[PDB]
Design a protein around this ligand. Structure first.
Ligand SMILES: *C(=O)OCCCCCCCCCC
Ligand SMILES: *C(=O)OCCCCCCCCCC
Lengths: 330, 329
């Protein structure tokens, strides 16, 4: 007997984006006591959001999902699955996805957590699109969520002003025309230490009164890697999608650093009038949540329009990257 | 307007191989605590604990090496790796890129997938989806677990349950369909049933308080798994277009033998159907459990390559993932 195969939608796209940004604004001056100029010129950040003590990666993911569902004209009963992508869910288990599903009033739906630094969103988008086309699901939530503030060593003058909190979710479903291109992804596992938790939780657990773990970043190494490698990645994603650089309306790189992204814009040879995501300005670097948060900001302000041709490039920890061409959601 | 390319990959995908790593240190029921007490309740006789210098990532690498060797492939033939685990003790970097680098394939795509014990089913399905979509042609999927450091040796409810190990599968194009449609789901309202009890940040901010351990509400998990997974198994067979009487091999997650005995009966397979019992000397290795159980069956010869197998993963998050597959190697 032959094992049967399911089939799903051919054309898949981003139906909606929904964003949750924590209430507390932390300015450059507040976090660093000419600090405002210093931080802004190096990173592009003016302010960022910090989540409250009672908030978590999962709780922000839930709020983002509620908003994404609303923008898609859907309820939780329309969703067949949810992928949470995060690096700041602070339990080995349970995973965030089932908790999020439950809070949404759809406790039974499939889901898992996906971790790949701030390439997680691209990987999760690709996985959702592949699952829907394979018939494993019809409509899915993909939410990038991050609570980075508790992981920051406020004495680490190399990164303390970089990381921030927030969540944003997209609805992926069948569309009239193809809305999501092939995923272009890869790694550099040899540079795994470039962005890291410096002390693993178990070594820490054997001596909790000694130094605790914090996020560490080898800035120059990441700058060099991102600025010199992601251009070729962007071109691969566009080639796979069958589009030219000059057909790109919107560029949404991961909001790691403005200077990096300015160099990527140049390398990718986009139109003079191409819209470039700059959400980092009042959001900072929110890792897995960055791209969908950046997408929401562009749509919220009317800088981008739904249906606009967008190039997304996620780069960051593990040294991991994931990129794809999409049409902008509602 | 501008077209976004519509693409496809190979429709027929299957398991080309399985490879297993288990650590050297055998910990008997007698040592850990007695033998009859644990055995009666779990079906566990012994389990393997990893050495201090081992990790989920290191065991996953070694399981991947063996998997590649058994498929007659090298690292250069692989387009990416999915690592599924619950015991990679870093928020970042993820295990997959490190595993890829250790295999001499630092550049390949990959990521970590967490869904408790059902991680392997989700990861398997995702790799199959990605290959059929044309995003990759050949993949490694590896379940890995170093659970021993997470055990509270004073917790008389679970200290004898969890163990260490890793197993990987090579997934790629096969002449006939080798991986059935994914059947998966959750119960997020019972998320507290299997859990880390104190989150890492709360612990870090309060080092004078207690440290985190794995906790298990046994009865709640038992009742959910024993009585709900039968229907899951039926759906996966239905999706694969196969009948219960056609299943050659049954591989439930090796959570508890007594749960699995009840599952066997509920599923109404042939009397001569082969049931995975790797828990006896491997214990419960969470995400690594199913591929380890597949490797054990092939190693003893109880299962043969090509045999029709039903895999059911169930556990934390309250999460489940199941599919019918043809046995590898
Ligand atoms: C994205 O820019 O990559 C950064 C990944 C953020 C995860 C940081 C992990 C913090 C753990 C330290 C306790
Ligand atoms: C299968 O039974 O799913 C169980 C998931 C493994 C539990 C590990 C999390 C405990 C960490 C405690 C520090």
């Amino acid at each position: 007997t032959e094992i049967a195969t399911t089939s799903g939608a051919r054309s898949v796209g981003l139906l909606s984006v929904g964003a949750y940004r924590p209430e507390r604004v932390v300015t450059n001056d507040e976090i660093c006591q000419s600090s405002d100029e210093w931080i802004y010129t190096r990173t592009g950040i003016k302010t960022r959001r910090f989540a409250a003590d009672d908030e978590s990666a999962a709780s922000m993911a839930t709020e983002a999902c509620r908003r994404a569902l609303s923008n898609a004209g859907l309820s939780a009963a329309d969703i067949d699955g949810v992928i949470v992508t995060t690096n700041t869910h602070f339990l080995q288990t349970p995973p965030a996805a089932p908790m999020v599903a439950a809070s949404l009033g759809a406790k039974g739906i499939l889901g898992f957590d996906l971790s790949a630094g701030c390439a997680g969103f691209g990987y999760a988008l690709g996985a959702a699109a592949d699952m829907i086309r394979g018939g494993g699901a019809a409509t899915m939530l993909v939410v990038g969520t991050e609570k980075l503030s508790p992981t920051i060593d406020m004495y680490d003058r190399g990164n303390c002003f970089i990381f921030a909190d927030g969540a944003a979710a997209v609805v992926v479903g069948e569309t009239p025309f193809q809305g999501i291109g092939p995923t272009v992804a890869g790694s550099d596992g040899e540079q795994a230490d470039a962005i890291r938790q410096d002390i693993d939780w178990i070594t820490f657990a054997q001596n909790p009164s000694g130094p605790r773990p914090f996020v560490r970043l080898e800035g120059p190494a990441v700058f060099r890697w991102a600025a010199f490698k992601m251009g070729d990645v962007g071109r691969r994603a566009m080639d796979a999608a069958g589009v030219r650089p000059d057909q790109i309306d919107v560029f949404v790189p991961h909001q790691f650093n403005s200077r990096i992204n300015e160099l990527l814009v140049k390398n990718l040879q986009l139109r003079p009038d191409a819209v470039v995501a700059n959400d980092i300005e009042h959001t900072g670097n929110t890792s897995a949540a960055s791209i969908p948060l950046a997408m929401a900001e562009l749509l919220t302000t009317g800088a981008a329009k739904p249906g606009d041709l967008a190039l997304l490039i996620g780069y960051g920890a593990g040294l991991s990257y994931a990129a794809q061409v999409v049409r902008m959601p509602k």
